[PDB]
Design an enzyme around this catalytic site. Structure first.
Site, PDB file in Angstrom:
ATOM      1  N   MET A   2      -1.781  -6.194  -2.367  1.00 15.25           N
ATOM      2  CA  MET A   2      -1.925  -5.032  -1.633  1.00 15.25           C
ATOM      3  C   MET A   2      -0.667  -4.165  -1.947  1.00 15.25           C
ATOM      4  O   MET A   2      -0.159  -3.366  -0.952  1.00 15.25           O
ATOM      5  CB  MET A   2      -1.947  -5.333  -0.255  1.00 15.25           C
ATOM      6  CG  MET A   2      -3.071  -5.938   0.314  1.00 15.25           C
ATOM      7  SD  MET A   2      -4.768  -5.175  -0.047  1.00 15.25           S
ATOM      8  CE  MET A   2      -4.594  -3.948   1.383  1.00 15.25           C
ATOM      9  N   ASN A   3      -0.414  -3.886  -2.995  1.00 12.95           N
ATOM     10  CA  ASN A   3       0.941  -2.861  -3.482  1.00 12.95           C
ATOM     11  C   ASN A   3       0.434  -2.665  -4.864  1.00 12.95           C
ATOM     12  O   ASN A   3       1.082  -3.004  -5.696  1.00 12.95           O
ATOM     13  CB  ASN A   3       2.225  -3.728  -3.233  1.00 12.95           C
ATOM     14  CG  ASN A   3       3.193  -2.640  -3.857  1.00 12.95           C
ATOM     15  OD1 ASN A   3       4.334  -3.152  -4.206  1.00 12.95           O
ATOM     16  ND2 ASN A   3       2.896  -1.595  -3.904  1.00 12.95           N
ATOM     17  N   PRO A   4      -0.561  -1.780  -5.271  1.00 12.38           N
ATOM     18  CA  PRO A   4      -0.963  -1.416  -6.535  1.00 12.38           C
ATOM     19  C   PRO A   4       0.015  -0.339  -7.371  1.00 12.38           C
ATOM     20  O   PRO A   4       0.863   0.410  -6.698  1.00 12.38           O
ATOM     21  CB  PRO A   4      -2.505  -0.740  -6.146  1.00 12.38           C
ATOM     22  CG  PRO A   4      -2.181  -0.145  -4.896  1.00 12.38           C
ATOM     23  CD  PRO A   4      -1.279  -1.069  -4.205  1.00 12.38           C
TER      24      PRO A   4
ATOM     25  N   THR B 207       0.651  -1.067  -0.062  1.00 15.89           N
ATOM     26  CA  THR B 207      -0.069  -0.144   0.020  1.00 15.89           C
ATOM     27  C   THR B 207       0.886   1.222  -0.030  1.00 15.89           C
ATOM     28  O   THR B 207       1.911   1.321   0.755  1.00 15.89           O
ATOM     29  CB  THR B 207      -1.006   0.133   1.086  1.00 15.89           C
ATOM     30  OG1 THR B 207      -2.071  -0.865   1.234  1.00 15.89           O
ATOM     31  CG2 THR B 207      -1.525   1.518   1.460  1.00 15.89           C
ATOM     32  N   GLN B 208       0.605   2.226  -0.810  1.00 14.04           N
ATOM     33  CA  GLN B 208       1.331   3.410  -1.067  1.00 14.04           C
ATOM     34  C   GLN B 208       0.367   4.614  -1.179  1.00 14.04           C
ATOM     35  O   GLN B 208      -0.876   4.384  -0.839  1.00 14.04           O
ATOM     36  CB  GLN B 208       2.146   3.211  -2.185  1.00 14.04           C
ATOM     37  CG  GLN B 208       1.578   2.705  -3.372  1.00 14.04           C
ATOM     38  CD  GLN B 208       2.378   2.537  -4.680  1.00 14.04           C
ATOM     39  OE1 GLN B 208       2.871   1.359  -5.003  1.00 14.04           O
ATOM     40  NE2 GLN B 208       2.552   3.681  -5.371  1.00 14.04           N
TER      41      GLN B 208
END
Lengths: 122, 233
Positions: B107-109, B1-2
């Site tokens: 969970m890291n788009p 997540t960013q």
């Protein structure tokens, strides 16, 4: 004694590596292929033996490209050739990904060199 | 997540009788700071596909690198790379779609909204959208972010349903799209006046126009407006 030519990484009494030499025999037994450096480029060419009329002409391509600026051709066990190009391709992608610029031919050569040299260590 | 940092706003597009048009301004915003102005957010892939990207710019540049590799890789041991086995727009899209969904699932788009526009080998128009959630859809017109609210309504007045496609010319279409870019410059606080536009026509090929500008704006009536209610001067 003898038997120095049965295992790949063994030094014979005269300091040679017989398996590497027997490998060469497989290369000499292969189709002939060449390369010519010109004033601003290079040319590759190879002989493709027509085993029979059944081979679709022009279809079984032998020359291979690496990245977008490198050509590779080889003589010997074709499958081994592809194996080497595959590595070359990963080798080139890795280099471009980190340094942005496509890989220089000298650098690319050593990449192939170290990889092949590696297959004479075990 | 960013969290996105440098971002690109709207990406608008639509299809017409012979192909598709797609556009995006040249801005790379940094919050409310309109930091970078020479950002090209339209990525051509071959000569039948243009990928428009909005969202996080660092991820866009990453999608760019992925696209270049796809082209290189497709060429390998492919004697038909520039013919029957060249990259189709649908291939480019399905690839990106796949990546976008895998990345959200980890969970890291890739914080973007993408529109892939182009013409398939059999002449068909291709227009599909994919975003950071991996969600995908097609429509005669497609826009991301702000252009979804303001561009789509305009473009849809030209091509409301499928049957309107064959009745829409490149001229009408490019006009609609150019007007939409102006409207977005009027109401979107994160837009630039400069933009790139690209056409992919099954006959004329890919036309990529750089350094366009919103022109013919209406601001004169601003002088007649004073105060905010009762003020007279």
């Amino acid at each position: 004694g003898t038997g120095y030519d049965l295992s790949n990484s063994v030094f014979s009494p005269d300091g040679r590596n017989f398996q590497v030499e027997y490998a060469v025999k497989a290369v000499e037994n292969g189709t002939t292929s060449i390369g010519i450096k010109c004033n601003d480029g290079v040319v590759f060419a190879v002989e493709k033996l027509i085993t029979s009329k059944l081979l679709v002409p022009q279809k079984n391509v032998k020359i291979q490209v690496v990245d977008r600026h490198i050509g590779c051709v080889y003589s010997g066990l074709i499958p081994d050739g592809r194996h080497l190009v595959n590595r070359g391709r990963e080798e080139a992608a890795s280099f471009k990904k980190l340094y942005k610029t496509p890989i220089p031919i000298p650098a690319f050569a050593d990449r192939l060199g170290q990889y092949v040299q590696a297959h004479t260590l075990y | 997540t960013q969290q996105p940092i440098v971002t690109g706003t709207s990406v608008i597009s639509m299809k017409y009788d012979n192909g598709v048009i797609i556009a995006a301004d040249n801005l790379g915003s940094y919050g409310s700071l309109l930091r970078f102005n020479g950002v090209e957010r339209l990525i051509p892939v071959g000569d039948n596909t243009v990928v428009g990207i909005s969202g996080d710019i660092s991820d866009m540049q990453h999608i760019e690198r992925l696209l270049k590799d796809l082209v290189t890789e497709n060429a390998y041991d492919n004697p038909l790379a520039d013919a029957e086995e060249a990259l189709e727009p649908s291939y480019i899209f399905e690839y990106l779609a796949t990546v976008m969904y895998q990345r959200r699932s980890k969970m890291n788009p890739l914080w973007n909204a993408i529109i892939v526009a182009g013409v398939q080998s059999n002449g068909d128009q291709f227009l599909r959208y994919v975003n950071l959630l991996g969600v995908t859809y097609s429509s005669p017109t497609l826009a991301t972010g702000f252009g979804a609210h303001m561009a789509n309504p305009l473009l849809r007045k030209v091509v409301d349903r499928e049957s309107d496609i064959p009745k829409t010319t490149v001229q009408v279409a490019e006009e609609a799209i150019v007007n939409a870019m102006r409207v977005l410059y009027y109401r979107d606080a994160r837009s630039s006046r400069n933009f790139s536009l690209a056409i992919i026509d099954k006959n004329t090929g890919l036309t990529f126009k750089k350094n366009l500008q919103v022109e013919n704006m209406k601001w004169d009536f601003a002088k007649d407006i004073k105060g905010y209610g009762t003020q007279k001067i």
